């Protein structure tokens, strides 16, 4: 995809994952689980809403055909009327199917996004206290608990904290 | 230790189309048009709908014999007529700007039935032979249009000038109608109206009508080569008609309150069964029940509908690519 | 030592809308739609529409002796007709193909009125006295429509069979105007025409007319039970006119050459004010002075006007996500 | 946002920088100041301008209602023409305002990306020669004098130049 | 040693614009409109078009002596009428409903000329004088309709009452026509059809016609003054006309079976020539031959045609922005 | 743009490249070449004609106009069918003309993304085994043959196999 996180550089997704959309999976002496970013997800949860309640009222007009009838001598109008009806409906499908094949591209798009983005801001946290290992994990070169754990994902990771711990480790 | 970064999966087999790629599983997904239907037509605000079951238009309001189940007033949300009714025009001939006809009625909600002209109106002429075997009722072979009075001389008499007049005082539009008729030989006419040149002359505040019999004969409709042809108007609330003849008139008799509707109006022409139900949205083929967006059932439509396109399905996707392992 | 990447804050309160996000503020935007008007009438390209005030388009151009201060030659870039205006038709009857009139008339530009037929054209007949209570002028209580006469016949004499011809030799198609009399009853019938079978009949080389009177009794209009049938046509260059009657016409006197527009016409039903003031866009409800794509105001204009859309808002971002610090 | 930059991992704006839309902070012995980057600001003006433009000339025909009445024995035809001009102003709302929406949203993007853009190619040119605080500023460990930091804004900064000062003050 | 990544560049010059952008040079694109046409009339499913050459459609279906290249059974995809074609209605008069009759015929792909009524349907008249030198044939300068039948009296003799009769026996809907005299005076009325009360009347199962002559001069139309009222209509399968006539008539001779088309019908009024060549798409101005998905050519066309747009051109970016080093 | 790649940090592209839309050009002992990258540019061609494929079919219906007549007293229809005929002329044309020029920047930027990515998928492949020019281009830091260069482009690169060649040129 576009932003080369979705089927890119992280596989695959996690069916054990099942309270959002983007999230971690750790692994430490305490053992491991799956965890939602409930902020991310929560943002792109109500960005897409948006977007699907925005072109449900844009869509929110109807073109009305008539039940009338139009005599032997009236085929002109007859046909105008008809050609007219047929007109709006080729307009509207045309702009439905149209916006539902380009939204969902940038849909899939703003997803893929989200993931690759979520990956930058663990990998800007951790530095040079961690080993990327190239498909969306790190390898800590200290040991990192459950309240470490939950500092990467909550934003407030302390590298200065371990950062001589994993220098000796690394070197 | 470790963590990693990554995303939802699921067990979801649903797929959408983007402009790069087509069957794509998604594992979120909402789909936007309904294609299901209740085949059968219901109420619509809780006002059910007028079936004219074996009558046509025509048959109703100009008063077919054969449509006195219909007679009378009527409200409505919508009409349904019946693709293979037979009762209309019984005795041949053409009701003039029929289709508009049928447009001004669509617009409407409510009729009420009213004597206008009694037939004490017509002076020196006879109101109680305009009988035919073109038009039966279901219980004697000669009959005629309820709404209608066929006038004919009186017996050896000449047909003198008849006059009526009726001021509309009330509120409401009056829907009325009227007819010339057109024997198939002066034998006919002498017969039934005597001799001399014969006229039927009409008019309000804003209408004039003058028309003359034109005798000849036609191929024969209902057993008939005589023709008569048919007219309606409408009285506007303040206007008076005035009607003068010494000949060949199909004088209005009954005629219609008519109440006009603020919403749209339907005439859905149609066999499928009026049955005891509620509906918001009401097609031409069906009943939908739903909070979708787009419809592929029919444009034909009363109440609140959703859009009508041809689309098979219009899915968009909510959640991501569906990238299960294994 | 140090540097940073960043990116422009002010103090912007303006918003945008995106398909993501409601109510976002952002550092530039440029407003697309025109909500407002100046609430009048101007000139559009240097040139003054006309009022028609008091009266009537079919007041004006039949000559309702009333409209004398529109009477003669006009020149409009759009009409404004007002919505009480009380001259139009004073002599009962329809104008037919009025619609159609009106359509014609609002393709124009400008108008000639000469006389196209002087009263001498008819030879046997008074031409003196055709005047009317239910058509009064400001100073007399018994007038006619300036562009029509009624012809009567003479004193006790017979009325003979009148002709006319009018042979348009100019480069511009023609407006004229003619009327079919329908006396209340034979008695006035006989005291204006006389008696015998009466007709009028018109011809060009594209067109042909025949009418004759319908007697009957319609209800009080402007005190009249009588009606007369108006009727419109045009000459076009290179054409000939035949009028030929026995009776009951309304002939036709001072005609109308006719202006096309090659711009787009207009006729604005509005109490709006004419000013002194000029626009490029004129809708009926007012003037637009804006360099906005869009418009809210309304689909009904003359000149160079932004699209009409529903919206009241459409903004597009230019700058950026406003975030300022603090 | 899509790119992580604006409201991102770059917090907020400057009300400091009032010339450009993108550019720099930088501090030094000869103090402190902002300055914008010209090029990609007047790059996205460019476009920006170019997309405002193209919405306005391919917004530019009209659809006509017309004043033209219809008789009491006219009411298909004029109905025909109601539901007509209804339909095209339906149509023509629809378009400028899905429009609207769509584009506000890429437009942000735009600026986005741009941003983010910005920031890698300042980060290339310094290399290991600048400390990355992860939020848009980078420490130099060497001297980084006026024309040393206009170096870096105009894409020529010399890094091998700093590189063993900057070494022996990183190690 | 060295590994770098980087992406494609040629020698193309051609460019695309984008909502940023204008005048982008692209590796590879695709131009979705068309603006080529071939500048004549092809064949359309391997059934050639009809020219009318010098006929224009009322002098084809009226049946104009000057038109017999026309007359008889004709197959067409569609019509081609010249733009200065001469031969129309020879004797001065209009076609009624003329649009629609055109409307009408444009809905056909075949027409089978036959003899609806004999000259002997109409016993007590001439049948055999009724030419005039407004219709002169190429070799006689006077004569008729081909599909007309102009009645007269015999010498000296009445015009009495005249039937006639046809059933329509067949499966497919019959286009015929017929008229009504009008003289320019009452000498030549009496000269024709003698005197008294003169009428023309038609009906079937669904259509009534009456007419009597309007009596008065017009201007002068290829020598005439008089004029004739052209009819058409169409008796469906299964339908009987009675035709019925005492003056004035101008009967119904020569008919046609009408073939309705399920395909779109087309009449192109156009000065470019029919070759022997095969086409898909057949506009107004010619011949698309194309893959593409637009064309700015015309509107109007038979077949299979990509959608017209107002476009100068609708290129697609396929490859990528082409940067060529050096 | 967009993505930085084309026209950006890698500043112009290679005619010598004519097999693929993207691709590797290679140095090492053997000698020099152009190589595409099959996998991704056969991606982008089947999206981007996918992508005229969809438009070309939604584009696939027509509106007619009719050569019906109308009389000198049927001004009102006659100008009703040409408001409407010519309604549907300018709706198609603006979503013909808007579409190309919406699908033209998004197509355009979807290269420029494919090339970042492709980018990307390679630097995380080599780490510190290579150096990073800043121009799309890694100077090994040990010795790649042709099947070191292969296994580069198909995405199997053995880091772990140079990592101590290239650990001590590096240092
Ligand atoms: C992001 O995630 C992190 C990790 O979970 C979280 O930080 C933890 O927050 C909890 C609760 O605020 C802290 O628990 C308290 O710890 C203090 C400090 O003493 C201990 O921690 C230090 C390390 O900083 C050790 O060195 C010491 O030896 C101690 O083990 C402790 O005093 C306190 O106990 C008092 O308060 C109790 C309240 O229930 C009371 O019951 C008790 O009797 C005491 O009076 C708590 O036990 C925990 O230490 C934090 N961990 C770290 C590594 O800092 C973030 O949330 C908070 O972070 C701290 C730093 C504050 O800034 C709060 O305002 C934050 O809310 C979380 N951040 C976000 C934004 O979600
Ligand atoms: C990006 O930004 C950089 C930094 O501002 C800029 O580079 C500077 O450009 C100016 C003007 O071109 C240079 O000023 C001249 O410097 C020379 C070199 O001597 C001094 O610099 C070196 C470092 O390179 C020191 O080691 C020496 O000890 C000196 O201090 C100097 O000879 C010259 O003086 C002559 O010319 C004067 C013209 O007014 C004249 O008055 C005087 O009497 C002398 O005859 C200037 O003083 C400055 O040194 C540059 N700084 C650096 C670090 O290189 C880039 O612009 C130019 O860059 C140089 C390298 C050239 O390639 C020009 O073509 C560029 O235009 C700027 N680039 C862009 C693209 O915007
Ligand atoms: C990505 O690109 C790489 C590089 O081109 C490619 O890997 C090469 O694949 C070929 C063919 O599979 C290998 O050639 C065989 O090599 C074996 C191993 O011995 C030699 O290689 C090792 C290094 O691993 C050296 O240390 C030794 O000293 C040897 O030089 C060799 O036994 C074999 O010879 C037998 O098979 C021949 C078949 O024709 C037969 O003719 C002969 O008589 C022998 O019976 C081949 O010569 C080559 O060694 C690989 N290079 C490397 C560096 O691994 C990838 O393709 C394959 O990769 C290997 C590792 C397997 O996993 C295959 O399944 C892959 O298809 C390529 N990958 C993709 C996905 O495209
Ligand atoms: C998916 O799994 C859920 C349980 O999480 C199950 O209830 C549901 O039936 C499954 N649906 C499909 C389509 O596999
Ligand atoms: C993909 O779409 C095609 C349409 O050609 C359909 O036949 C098929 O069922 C779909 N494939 C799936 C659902 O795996
Ligand atoms: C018309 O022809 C049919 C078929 O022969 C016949 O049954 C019918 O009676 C005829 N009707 C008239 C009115 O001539
Ligand atoms: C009806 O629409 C609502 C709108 O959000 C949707 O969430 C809900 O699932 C729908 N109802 C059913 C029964 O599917
Ligand atoms: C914004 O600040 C400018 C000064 O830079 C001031 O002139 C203007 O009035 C302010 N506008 C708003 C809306 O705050
Ligand atoms: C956001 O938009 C809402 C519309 O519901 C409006 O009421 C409100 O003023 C806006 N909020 C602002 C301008 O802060
Ligand atoms: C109609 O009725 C009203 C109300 O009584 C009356 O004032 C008016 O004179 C009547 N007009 C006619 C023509 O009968
Ligand atoms: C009118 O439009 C121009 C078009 O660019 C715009 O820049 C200008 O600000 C507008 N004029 C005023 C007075 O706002
Ligand atoms: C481009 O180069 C090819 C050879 O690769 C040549 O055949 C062609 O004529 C050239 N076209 C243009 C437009 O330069
Ligand atoms: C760019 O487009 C312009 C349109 O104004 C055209 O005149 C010119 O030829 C184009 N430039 C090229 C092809 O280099
Ligand atoms: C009309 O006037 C022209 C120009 O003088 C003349 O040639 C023509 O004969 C006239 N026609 C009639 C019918 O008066
Ligand atoms: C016709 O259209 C096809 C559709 O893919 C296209 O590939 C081909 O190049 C076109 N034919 C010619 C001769 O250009």
């Given at each position: 995809?576009?932003?080369?996180?979705?089927?890119?550089?992280?596989?695959?997704?996690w069916?054990?994952?099942?309270?959002?959309?983007?999230?971690?999976?750790?692994?430490?002496?305490?053992?491991?689980?799956?965890?939602?970013?409930?902020?991310?997800?929560?943002?792109?949860?109500?960005?897409i809403?948006?977007?699907?309640?925005?072109?449900?009222?844009?869509?929110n007009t109807?073109?009305?055909?008539?039940?009338?009838?139009?005599?032997?001598?009236?085929?002109?109008?007859?046909?105008?009327?008809?050609?007219?009806?047929?007109?709006?409906?080729?307009?509207?499908?045309?702009?439905?199917?149209?916006?539902?094949?380009?939204?969902?591209?940038?849909?899939?798009?703003?997803?893929?996004?989200?993931?690759?983005?979520?990956?930058?801001?663990?990998?800007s946290?951790?530095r040079?206290?961690?080993?990327?290992?190239?498909?969306?994990?790190?390898?800590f070169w200290?040991?990192?608990?459950?309240?470490?754990?939950?500092?990467?994902?909550?934003?407030?990771?302390?590298?200065?904290?371990?950062?001589?711990?994993?220098?000796?480790?690394?070197? | 230790?470790?963590?990693?970064?990554?995303?939802?999966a699921?067990?979801?087999?649903?797929?959408?189309?983007?402009?790069?790629?087509?069957?794509?599983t998604?594992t979120?997904?909402?789909?936007?048009?309904?294609?299901?239907?209740?085949?059968?037509?219901?109420?619509?605000?809780?006002?059910?709908?007028?079936?004219?079951?074996?009558?046509?238009?025509?048959?109703?309001?100009?008063?077919?014999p054969?449509?006195?189940?219909?007679?009378?007033?009527?409200?409505?949300?919508?009409?349904?007529?019946?693709?293979?009714?037979?009762?209309?025009?019984?005795?041949?001939?053409?009701?003039?700007?029929?289709?508009?006809?049928?447009?001004?009625?669509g617009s409407?909600?409510?009729?009420?039935?009213?004597?206008?002209?009694?037939?004490?109106?017509?002076?020196?002429?006879?109101?109680?032979?305009?009988?035919?075997?073109?038009?039966?009722?279901?219980?004697?072979?000669?009959?005629?249009?309820?709404?209608?009075?066929?006038?004919?001389?009186?017996?050896?008499?000449?047909?003198?000038?008849?006059?009526?007049?009726?001021?509309?005082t009330?509120?409401?539009?009056?829907?009325?109608?009227?007819?010339?008729?057109?024997?198939?030989?002066?034998?006919?006419?002498?017969?039934?109206?005597?001799?001399?040149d014969?006229?039927?002359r009409?008019?309000?505040?804003?209408?004039?009508?003058?028309?003359?019999?034109?005798?000849?004969?036609?191929?024969?409709?209902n057993?008939?080569?005589?023709?008569?042809?048919?007219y309606?108007?409408?009285?506007?609330?303040?206007?008076?008609?005035?009607?003068?003849?010494?000949?060949?008139?199909?004088?209005?008799?009954?005629?219609?309150?008519?109440?006009?509707?603020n919403?749209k109006?339907?005439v859905?022409?149609?066999?499928?069964?009026?049955?005891?139900?509620?509906?918001?949205?009401?097609?031409?083929?069906?009943?939908?029940?739903?909070?979708?967006?787009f419809?592929?059932?029919?444009?034909?439509?009363?109440?609140?509908?959703?859009?009508?396109?041809?689309?098979?399905?219009?899915?968009?996707?909510?959640?991501?690519?569906?990238?299960?392992?294994?």
């Amino acid at each position: 995809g576009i932003f080369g996180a979705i089927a890119g550089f992280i596989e695959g997704g996690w069916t054990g994952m099942i309270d959002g959309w983007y999230g971690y999976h750790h692994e430490n002496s305490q053992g491991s689980g799956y965890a939602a970013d409930r902020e991310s997800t929560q943002k792109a949860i109500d960005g897409i809403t948006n977007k699907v309640n925005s072109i449900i009222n844009k869509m929110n007009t109807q073109f009305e055909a008539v039940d009338h009838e139009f005599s032997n001598l009236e085929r002109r109008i007859g046909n105008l009327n008809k050609r007219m009806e047929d007109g709006f409906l080729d307009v509207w499908t045309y702009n439905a199917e149209l916006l539902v094949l380009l939204e969902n591209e940038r849909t899939l798009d703003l997803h893929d996004a989200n993931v690759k983005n979520l990956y930058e801001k663990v990998k800007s946290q951790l530095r040079d206290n961690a080993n990327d290992l190239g498909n969306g994990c790190f390898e800590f070169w200290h040991k990192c608990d459950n309240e470490c754990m939950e500092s990467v994902k909550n934003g407030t990771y302390d590298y200065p904290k371990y950062q001589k711990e994993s220098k000796l480790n690394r070197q | 230790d470790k963590i990693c970064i990554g995303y939802h999966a699921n067990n979801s087999t649903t797929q959408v189309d983007t402009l790069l790629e087509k069957n794509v599983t998604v594992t979120h997904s909402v789909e936007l048009l309904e294609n299901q239907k209740e085949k059968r037509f219901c109420k619509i605000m809780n006002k059910a709908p007028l079936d004219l079951k074996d009558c046509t238009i025509e048959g109703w309001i100009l008063g077919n014999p054969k449509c006195d189940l219909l007679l009378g007033d009527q409200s409505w949300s919508y009409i349904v007529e019946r693709p293979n009714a037979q009762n209309g025009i019984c005795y041949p001939g053409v009701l003039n700007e029929l289709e508009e006809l049928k447009a001004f009625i669509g617009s409407g909600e409510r009729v009420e039935r009213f004597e206008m002209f009694p037939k004490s109106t017509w002076a020196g002429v006879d109101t109680s032979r305009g009988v035919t075997n073109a038009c039966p009722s279901y219980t004697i072979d000669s009959s005629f249009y309820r709404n209608l009075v066929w006038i004919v001389k009186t017996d050896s008499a000449t047909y003198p000038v008849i006059k009526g007049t009726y001021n509309n005082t009330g509120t409401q539009p009056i829907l009325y109608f009227w007819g010339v008729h057109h024997p198939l030989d002066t034998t006919v006419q002498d017969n039934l109206y005597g001799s001399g040149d014969k006229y039927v002359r009409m008019g309000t505040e804003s209408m004039n009508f003058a028309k003359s019999p034109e005798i000849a004969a036609r191929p024969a409709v209902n057993g008939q080569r005589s023709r008569i042809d048919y007219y309606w108007s409408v009285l506007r609330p303040g206007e008076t008609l005035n009607v003068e003849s010494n000949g060949n008139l199909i004088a209005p008799w009954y005629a219609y309150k008519f109440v006009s509707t603020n919403k749209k109006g339907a005439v859905f022409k149609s066999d499928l069964p009026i049955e005891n139900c509620d509906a918001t949205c009401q097609t031409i083929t069906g009943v939908l029940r739903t909070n979708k967006t787009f419809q592929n059932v029919s444009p034909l439509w009363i109440g609140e509908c959703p859009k009508y396109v041809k689309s098979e399905s219009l899915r968009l996707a909510t959640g991501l690519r569906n990238v299960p392992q294994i």
